[PDB]
């Protein structure tokens, strides 16, 4: 019965706020609290702050106190978290969680915790704007034989914001492929790799082709990779 | 505050065996509000112990939690391929704090890298910056060590490396290794090589290869 929708990823330049929702369904409201986590990309759960559903009392963390506002609409049982004055290392997946720590009504401890969760909505500070990735081949050669196995990718470089898809062989080559997470370089922009390993005796014969996709850009970019001479 | 420190950061241990993991805190934490979740890759935190030891609904009896004061243990009695997770334990006795959190990791026998290099494409060459790529394929354990060389001289401060999460067939790392130059800069030397250090080597393993070869 219990269910939390949030609402959709956010894209937000330096200094703005980002309002994020958590419609609540299947359960009395007014009865639990509602608690908001986030998690940075790579980094753990961080705690920001409680709610209470019935009279509006709020409890923030000391780090986000002065840019977090937590504010609930029992009419819509509809949870919302503002965060105003983002900075980059604000860029985090934002959780909201039925809270059962803290009682909604007198504020004592409970017994429990939180029990279930949101989907999750990533938020994403920069000051880049969209940029469609530029795909570079990483052609194959002697060097990039270990035994009877070649090794070749692509390189995805230059782009904002995440994610891209990469695909070989329109998705028939899926056995042997690795799409290494994206880097973030220092000029803002995103930028990683995809490889596969192949018998070095289909070098000459087969043809290999990564499919780069970039949505926020509309880039479909279709490099062919060939073993350089 | 109270400071959660959960160790070690990374668990390795093969599936079936038993797993303990500890959440030790700065101060004396009540029983009845310490909590512990499980976090699966790319999937929100899941409740998992509460109070300590009382499971919540719907989580398998091979978790159990224990521990009173300030040192609290998270027992999985058998690892399940799923188990394999990020588990975090929450304490709301002042304020509320989550942990560090414990990586399970999957404990496979020592995989030496395939070490591949490539150069960087004559098309990106025509937009003046060279990107060098060396490729770490399938190895085991994560920790690895990749140094750039040009022309002898080792780089620093001017690569950046992506490492895949453990590959869910052979339990095996990918590691990435981008050494990015301008066209200028690039052009100035002949020799490119990274020297791949890693416990399955009993030597560093060195790909190279010479610009305009
Ligand atoms: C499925 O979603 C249900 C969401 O709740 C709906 C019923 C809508 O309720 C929302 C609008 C709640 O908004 C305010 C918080 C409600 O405040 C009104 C004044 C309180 O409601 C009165 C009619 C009765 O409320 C009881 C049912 C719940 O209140 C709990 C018990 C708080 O108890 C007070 C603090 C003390 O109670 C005295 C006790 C000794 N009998």
């Known amino acids: 019965q219990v269910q939390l929708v949030q609402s959709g990823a956010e894209v937000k330049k330096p200094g703005a706020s980002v309002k994020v929702s958590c419609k609540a369904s299947g359960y009395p409201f007014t009865s639990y609290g509602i608690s908001w986590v986030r998690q940075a990309p790579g980094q753990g759960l961080e705690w920001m702050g409680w709610i209470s559903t019935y009279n509006g009392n709020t409890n923030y963390a000391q780090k986000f106190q002065g840019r977090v506002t937590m504010t609930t609409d029992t009419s819509t049982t509809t949870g919302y978290m503002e965060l105003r004055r983002l900075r ?15 009682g909604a009504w007198f504020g004592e401890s409970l017994i429990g915790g939180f029990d279930n969760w949101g989907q999750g909505t990533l938020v994403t500070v920069s000051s880049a704007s969209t940029k469609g990735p530029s795909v570079f081949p990483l052609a194959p050669s002697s060097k990039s034989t270990s035994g009877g196995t070649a090794a070749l990718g692509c390189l995805v470089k230059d782009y904002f914001p995440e994610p891209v898809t990469v695909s070989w062989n329109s998705g028939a080559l899926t056995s042997g492929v690795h799409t290494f997470p994206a880097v973030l370089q220092s000029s803002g922009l995103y930028s990683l790799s995809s490889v596969v390993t192949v018998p070095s005796s289909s ?8 499919n780069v996709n970039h949505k926020p850009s509309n880039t479909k970019v279709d490099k062919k990779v060939e073993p350089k001479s | 505050e109270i400071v959660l420190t959960q160790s070690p950061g990374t668990l390795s241990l093969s599936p079936g065996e038993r797993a303990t993991l500890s959440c030790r805190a700065s101060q004396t934490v009540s029983s009845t509000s310490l909590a512990w979740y499980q976090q699966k890759p790319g999937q929100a935190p899941r409740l998992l112990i509460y109070g300590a030891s009382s499971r919540a609904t719907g989580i398998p009896d091979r978790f159990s939690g224990s521990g009173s004061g300030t040192d609290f243990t998270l027992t999985i009695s058998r690892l399940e391929p799923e188990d394999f997770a ?7 006795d002042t304020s509320l704090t989550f942990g560090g959190g414990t990586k399970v990791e999957i404990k496979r026998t020592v995989a030496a890298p395939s070490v591949f290099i490539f150069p960087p494409s004559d098309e990106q060459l025509k937009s003046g910056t060279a990107s060098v790529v060396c490729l770490l394929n399938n190895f085991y354990p994560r920790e690895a060590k990749v140094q750039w060389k040009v022309d002898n001289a080792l780089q620093s401060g001017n690569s950046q490396e992506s490492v895949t999460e453990q590959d869910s067939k052979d339990s095996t790392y990918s590691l990435s290794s981008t050494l990015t130059l301008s066209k200028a800069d690039y052009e100035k030397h002949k020799v490119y090589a990274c020297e791949v250090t890693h416990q399955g080597l009993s030597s560093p393993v060195t790909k190279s290869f010479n610009r305009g070869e």
């Open chain 1, 203 to 210: 070098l000459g014969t087969q043809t290999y082709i990564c």
């Open chain 2, 86 to 92: 990020v588990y975090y334990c929450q304490q709301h």
């Open chain 1, 88 to 102: 980059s290392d604000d860029t985090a997946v934002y959780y909201c969680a039925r809270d059962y720590t803290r």
